[PDB]
Design a protein around this ligand. Sequence first.
Ligand code: B12
Ligand code: NA
Ligand code: NA
Lengths: 453, 453, 453, 252
Amino acid sequence: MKLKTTLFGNVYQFKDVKEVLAKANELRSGDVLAGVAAASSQERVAAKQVLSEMTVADIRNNPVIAYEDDCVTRLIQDDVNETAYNQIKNWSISELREYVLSDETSVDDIAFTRKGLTSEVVAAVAKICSNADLIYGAKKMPVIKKANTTIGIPGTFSARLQPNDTRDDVQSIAAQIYEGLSFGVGDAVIGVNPVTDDVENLSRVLDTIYGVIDKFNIPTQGCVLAHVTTQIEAIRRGAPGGLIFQSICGSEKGLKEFGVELAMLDEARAVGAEFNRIAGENCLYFETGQGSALSAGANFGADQVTMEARNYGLARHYDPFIVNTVVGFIGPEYLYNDRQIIRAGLEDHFMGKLSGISMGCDCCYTNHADADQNLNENLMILLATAGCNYIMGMPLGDDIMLNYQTTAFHDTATVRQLLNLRPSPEFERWLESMGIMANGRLTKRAGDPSLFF
Amino acid sequence: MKLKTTLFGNVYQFKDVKEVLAKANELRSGDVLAGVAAASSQERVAAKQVLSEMTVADIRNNPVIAYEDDCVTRLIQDDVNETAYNQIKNWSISELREYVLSDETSVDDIAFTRKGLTSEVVAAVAKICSNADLIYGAKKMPVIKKANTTIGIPGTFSARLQPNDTRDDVQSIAAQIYEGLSFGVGDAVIGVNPVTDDVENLSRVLDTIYGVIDKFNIPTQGCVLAHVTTQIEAIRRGAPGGLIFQSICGSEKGLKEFGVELAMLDEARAVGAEFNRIAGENCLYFETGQGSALSAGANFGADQVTMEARNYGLARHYDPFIVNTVVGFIGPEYLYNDRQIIRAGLEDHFMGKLSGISMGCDCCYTNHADADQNLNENLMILLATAGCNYIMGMPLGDDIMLNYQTTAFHDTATVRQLLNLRPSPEFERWLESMGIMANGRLTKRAGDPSLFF
Amino acid sequence: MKLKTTLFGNVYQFKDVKEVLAKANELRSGDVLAGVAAASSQERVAAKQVLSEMTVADIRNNPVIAYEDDCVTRLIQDDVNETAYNQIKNWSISELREYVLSDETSVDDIAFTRKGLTSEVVAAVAKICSNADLIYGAKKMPVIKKANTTIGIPGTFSARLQPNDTRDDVQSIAAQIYEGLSFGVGDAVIGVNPVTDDVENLSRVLDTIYGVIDKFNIPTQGCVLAHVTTQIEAIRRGAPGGLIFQSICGSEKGLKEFGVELAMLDEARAVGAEFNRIAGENCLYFETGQGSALSAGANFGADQVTMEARNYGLARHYDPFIVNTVVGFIGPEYLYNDRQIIRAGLEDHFMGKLSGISMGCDCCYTNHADADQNLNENLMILLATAGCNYIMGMPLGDDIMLNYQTTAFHDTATVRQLLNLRPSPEFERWLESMGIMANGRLTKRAGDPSLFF
Amino acid sequence: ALDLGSAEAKAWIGVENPHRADVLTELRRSTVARVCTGRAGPRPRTQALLRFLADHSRSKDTVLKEVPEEWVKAQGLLEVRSEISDKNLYLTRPDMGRRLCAEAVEALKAQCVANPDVQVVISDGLSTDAITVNYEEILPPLMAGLKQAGLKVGTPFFVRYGRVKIEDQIGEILGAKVVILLVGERPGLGQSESLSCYAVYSPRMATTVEADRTCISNIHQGGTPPVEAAAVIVDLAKRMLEQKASGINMTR
Ligand code: B12
Ligand code: NA
Ligand code: NA
């Protein structure tokens, strides 16, 4: 280990791997808040070069929370293919970056190589990547899963129907579902964040979602995004199980903040296998995002990019159908503006794909962040070129109860027709038979929720 | 017309079309400097709504500099197809936006409709477009021209080789040419901005460019980007004529600032037809960019988006092979940061394509602007999805001489392989014969200027 | 210059380039009438060899009417790319013939090379070409233009609807239009030669044509083939402008015979740009044919093939949408029989394509020529293999007021289905939606003008 | 181990399996452009990206960099400023950079010699380094050029926060027949010492356009040497007074 270079004659010294990981980040508001950011542009570049010259072994053997003290660290470390690790352990992070980006590196090459990574090493690669590096790197690392739809095939682009309501009103949820489907949204999942966290309400919202699914024989899956214990409860007691959701955090302390034990996610897998209406082998759904560990007190002096990578190492253990970052869900204190939210979105998606999870992005912002809808549209298109597995859909992107702006139903149809991308093949076939889609494109009759009536 | 709307109970009044056009702009530092920007987000939206409800006739019949006072206004107005105009003159700008964006509007529909437009109307549509509107709208309006390459075919993506040197040293120009061609850059043009402005030096720079072109039988064209008069002088006296370049401005006073008469561009067309080594029918090359009229004292109270649209109306008269905005060429006083430069890039490109010119973009920034290379990489990819005809290439994007950062040779290869786009078909054939490209992708021994030796 | 060879021991001497051009022609009745023909077969071959050994400079620098005395000569000479000319000026006509015919010569090679030609040089190449030379040579020189249809794409074949009537009766014109469209004729133009040359009648005939076009939303264009001044008058006063027509002749004296000044064709271009209902950039329509200069007193001792080539050099200046020779329009005094009319048709089309105009042919004969309908069918098929851009269509080819026989509506459908050629792509799409065409072929319902009722 | 600002970092060949590596070195020698750095797929190599990022961090500082008032005083120069107060306002307001402040006008009438044939103005503009590196090389032989055989020479003076059009107002107030402005053009990625000369015959605020100016650009040690450029600008000034013309109105 060098923890040291000289830049324009000036010696830059850092204390540990954790500080080098933190200060190599592009400027964001969360790293300044965490106290972990570079003091200058020159120290940023010095941290980047130190990181680049550090080896895979250097980063692997210094996780940001230690093995003994953290079950997520344990889970990440114990999932390593040590044969894959031993092949690459004396690679520099510079060499690993160039390996990932190389056109002579195949999907099958990275398939084995990523098994020798930990999340800290995944983070380290992203930190010395430019924006086009993150986009091209992610594009050449497809991850494909299957529920009742197949997601993540190159040339395809999926979307979550997010039909949220302030009262969980079943007419208002159904209204937004019919609108979303008319734009070809919902092949990732039809997924409601409920107001109330109880079995009767969970089951009623699931009955509404699956009422629509069963009437029109839609190849998709439903989800209610309450706490994982309440989902399991509802499904055991006979509510239709589709995807099972949990928000996750990249430390044990962060999971405790969220009220999650790892054995709940074990249980969710087993409940999925017994109960859930899923043709394929993946039925889990996680959401993540930069800032959450820092909110929780639970980052332990580590930056939010490294902590967010540790989400993906956690998620990978459970082989979910879908994961998305919710990239600007929280506010300006972690990511301040357009530039920071785009960069985070590209980082999050690259790191997800490098970790080998089915990685999408809620391209989003809040009204107290320095941000508008043109940022969502910038980011969703960049990420779609990166082969982002899915985004969200809401009516014009206005969430009326989560109080933020995500992407429109329009935006998925736009991305698909702009970039010549198709839905999930199962869902596309359904859209064609409904008269909503022809040759990847919305028909004249599309965009009209009254088609279903 | 109405110069007036009520928004949340408050009346928003504007003085004229010119003010409505200006305040409808997304926030940029140039409109604030010009004194013409909206005072708030609310007055911006009110301006947008007033603009959207104004007719095509309202904006056609109020150009921002008057017919009798301005030769660019005269050129724009006299080029109108009045039959196409009369069909659309009572359309609102809201209706024209929706017409442009509609999937039931074909390339051939817009081909006739755009002949009824003036530049101010073209500006008016862009001003009420979102970022995804600008990208999708531009994409469904391809513009194809032909020199020794064909540019602008959907599924293709071209690049100017820009081999600039601080002394016009012929070894340094040559070195940058060989590097560019090895990445597949140069199908738009091989185009030097010269230090000295001067027939001996122009001919020597052109001899260097065409030395490489003739040795390897390259389907492309050379250009030297001195003032149009010295180009014409040099070509008349027997230097190789490829593309003939001029920087243009969207008013008569702006052209006088640049030392340009309209009859010089007539002459450049005539000299092209007599002298120039061009197989196709297009041989002119213009560059543009927001802020230039405001710099010249020549915007006449108009915003820089409306002025930039008028560049394209001027350009369209001369049916050039290529035009690009040089989007962040000048600095922060006209476009301050990432978000403003992206927005302007998308505006400029959309407006060019709506004006029916072969529109590209120098995705660029300066070092006194709030900007870095990740912005260039953000913008080049967004614009490539919009079907941007071409960008620049320089070695890592570093201009050693014009003192700014544009896109890398890398970046064109990245865009093409990310988005499954090819070069100009003639240039692609050459790259395949050289062993630089197979199936749209750089071969192993590409990226290496020593291939040519 | 040699003006001299020896053939079988016998010395053949000619006075000038003009005599060599004249006597190298294949035997036709017009050259004998002009007094310019070879006296024997041996002198024909001797003239051919002298011509073949003469250089491009020899022919260029001796036009058949001099620069000072003739505005068409001036127009042809002043349109030369001198750089293209200087490359080829020391080529023999033999070498230029072999260059044109070579499979190693591309479309883009000839694109530049033809710009260094004049019409006399174009004529000289054709004179030493065999019939298969003229056909294969023309086939590998496609010329593509666009009005509301694209014409001249390889693999396509277009047709003029020629719905002429003895009284300009609007029911009889409409009848022939409906019949023509049912056979897939009219993608070049729907074009009436009127009886009476006045604005009210011109406008009424245009209203009838565009009545049909607008009702069925046909991608095509209308034309009334009166004198160009009367067309301009009608269109200014608010008649629908499609294509603007003029018959042309290859000398200034010939234009004066026709009542044409060049500034009328300038005006027609500008009137097109202001008024005309045309999506693409080409809106002019010329007709030509061998014999017209000789009729006018206006050939100045030059043969009719050289004079007809000068039509195409004139036409090329104005970049028309379409040109056709009207190959046997006049009578036996210029082209006597089947063999002469076929040869002229092949010459005319080759020379048009070499001149870079969108060249078709009215394959036709008169009742006082030694000719019948089997000649029309011979020639139309040969020219279709040569990639003739369009022919005429009339009901069985019987023109009831111009008193000659052109090609049937049947003949375009025959050629298309024989040779696997399609209409203009825009027009083909319209035919498919009308149920007239499937896969390039007439449906069962086609050939029936009552389909439109 | 490598400093990214070193000559070894600048000379780095990154091309992985070269067709001809002796050509590669002599191509790298031929230019200051970032050639021959190779690729990883279609993307830049890591060291090339790192050195780019290092050079940009250095470039950002040079736009905010200001010369000491004391350095201007040590050159024997009058310091005057524009309407601009500070570096941050300079970057956003070019219109104020194009006008002398009220105290600047009165200082020029006080302290400078009246109706010169040739007036040299020097301004930091957008790069201080372009002035500070180049000054002693360019300015003495420029002054000794215009004096020795020739003319009524103005006294040279610094304008802080100057944009190019300010030389029209300087021409009007001082009565100058030729105004030469030596000014810092905007900083490149890997250099900051690029000076331009902007020079104009007999300017007027109402009437002078940009094309009326002659530009001599890229004056530094990696461009046209400041000593060599000094004799260029003198010869330009002599031609300007002969022809009574500048910019596009000049012959040849
Ligand atoms: C930025 C820039 C521009 C901008 C200027 C807008 C602005 N507000 O900055 C735009 C895009 C408008 C521009 C246009 C052109 N430019 Co310029 N420009 C530059 C650049 C990169 C920076 C100059 C600078 O930093 N100035 C210093 C700052 C402090 O001055 P400023 O007050 O903020 O800006 C003023 C000057 O930049 C001036 N200016 C800019 N370009 C030119 C060109 C000429 C000939 C003149 C007299 C003045 C001039 O206009 C501004 C005042 O309104 C230089 C390259 C370089 N490395 O210097 C080329 C450069 C000066 N440009 C050049 C040329 C030729 C042109 C054009 C004539 C191109 C063309 N063929 O039409 C046009 C027309 C210029 C005009 N007459 O107005 C050449 C000059 C060659 C010469 N020795 O004559 C240069 C050196 C680049 C090159 N090709 O080598 N340019
Ligand atoms: Na934005
Ligand atoms: Na016959």
